[PDB]
Amino acid sequence: TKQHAFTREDLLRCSRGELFGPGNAQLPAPNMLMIDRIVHISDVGGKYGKGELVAELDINPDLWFFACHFEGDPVMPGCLGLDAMWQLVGFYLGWQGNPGRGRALGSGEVKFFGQVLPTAKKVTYNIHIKRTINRSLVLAIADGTVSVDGREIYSAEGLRVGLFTSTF
Amino acid sequence: TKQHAFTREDLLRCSRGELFGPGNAQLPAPNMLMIDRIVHISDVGGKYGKGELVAELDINPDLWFFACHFEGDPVMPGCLGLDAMWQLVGFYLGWQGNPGRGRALGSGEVKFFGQVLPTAKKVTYNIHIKRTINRSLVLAIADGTVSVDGREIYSAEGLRVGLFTSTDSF
Ligand SMILES: CCCCCSc1ncn[nH]1
Ligand SMILES: CCCCCSc1ncn[nH]1
Numbered sequence: 001t002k003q004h005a006f007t008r009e010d011l012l013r014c015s016r017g018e019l020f021g022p023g024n025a026q027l028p029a030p031n032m033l034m035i036d037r038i039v040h041i042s043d044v045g046g047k048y049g050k051g052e053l054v055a056e057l058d059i060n061p062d063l064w065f066f067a068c069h070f071e072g073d074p075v076m077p078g079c080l081g082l083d084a085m086w087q088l089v090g091f092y093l094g095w096q097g098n099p100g101r102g103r104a105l106g107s108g109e110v111k112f113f114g115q116v117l118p119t120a121k122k123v124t125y126n127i128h129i130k131r132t133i134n135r136s137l138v139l140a141i142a143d144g145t146v147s148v149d150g151r152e153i154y155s156a157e158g159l160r161v162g163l164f165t166s167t168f
Numbered sequence: 169t170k171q172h173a174f175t176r177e178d179l180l181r182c183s184r185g186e187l188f189g190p191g192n193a194q195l196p197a198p199n200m201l202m203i204d205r206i207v208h209i210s211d212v213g214g215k216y217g218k219g220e221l222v223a224e225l226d227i228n229p230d231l232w233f234f235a236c237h238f239e240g241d242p243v244m245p246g247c248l249g250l251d252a253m254w255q256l257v258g259f260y261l262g263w264q265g266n267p268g269r270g271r272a273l274g275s276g277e278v279k280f281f282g283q284v285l286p287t288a289k290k291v292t293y294n295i296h297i298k299r300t301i302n303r304s305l306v307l308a309i310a311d312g313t314v315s316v317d318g319r320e321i322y323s324a325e326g327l328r329v330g331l332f333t334s335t336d337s338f
Contacts, residue, residue, distance in 0.1 A: 016239060028237035032245060069196035071184060077200060078272045079251035104246045104280050111274040115338050167241065168283050
């Protein structure tokens with residue numbers, strides 16, 4: 001029943017609410033959307049055996065955030081790479097067929113120890129689903145890392161995203 | 169260490185690199201800047217006795233992020249409120265007179281347990297500096313909370329921001 005890779009246009013469709021349906025998970029649209037394509041997604045395998053996503057974002061100097069962050073010293077904001085990981089975990093929940101709107105619930109340790117310059121080519125996200133809880137509220141817990149051109153730069157442990165039937 | 173409150177235009181000046189000077193801390197400019205004003209900043213008091221910042225962001229429905237996040241369900245992204253806390257801690261380091269460019273280093277527990285709708289009036293940030301380290305790299309550790317119209321919605325423990333001179337590597 002399941003598609004395992006998505007193009008930018010599949011994601012934009014999701015952003016309109018047309019991939020998972022109305023009242024279900026949506027990715028944000030530009031300029032908040034931090035994913036160009038989902039290269040792989042399954043509910044088996046991964047670090048913990050409970051699924052995995054691999055996603056990419058193409059970089060070029062003209063990306064909007066580089067001009068305002070910072071003047072004379074462009075660099076992609078860490079919060080945006082962080083948010084991509086939440087975006088992806090949300091996407092995963094909706095992709096599993098669960099109903100409701102997505103909201104990030106937070107995380108454990110987050111680390112930034114590198115940066116994305118405008119001279120980079122591609123950012124890649126790797127997410128490992130640790131647990132899904134299907135009680136009175138439905139939620140996913142995952143670890144994620146963000147890499148730029150092969151090199152690992154951010155990490156986030158215990159990312160939490162939850163789904164809300166009635167919008168918190 | 170002298171001025172204890174800043175206006176939006178002080179912050180835009182900072183964003184140009186004209187408040188703390190070249191090679192020192194800068195806030196980002198719009199649309200990444202998540203602060204309209206810093207209502208209070210000192211290096212004494214706060215939760216831990218090592219300083220405090222209180223800052224505000226005015227909300228209105230036409231803020232850019234509401235239109236793309238999400239279509240049919242606008243809500244301020246949590247990462248942006250989070251980033252405001254890092255922006256503020258960075259600002260604090262430069263305001264103390266330390267040299268170097270700011271980079272968020274991460275945090276411990278982050279919690280989102282409410283939201284900012286476009287019908288809100290004002291987001292307020294409260295940051296408590298826990299520790300500053302002035303070793304070979306200079307950095308600040310702080311807890312912060314984000315509130316909307318009086319109500320507490322996000323919290324971040326162990327926010328870390330560090331300063332990087334022209335010799336310091338990333
Ligand atoms: C203090 C302003 C927060 C923006 C910096 S985001 C960042 N990228 C790599 N490290 N940190
Ligand atoms: C499902 C997409 C993940 C982004 C939700 S961002 C958020 N807004 C208020 N709390 N958290």
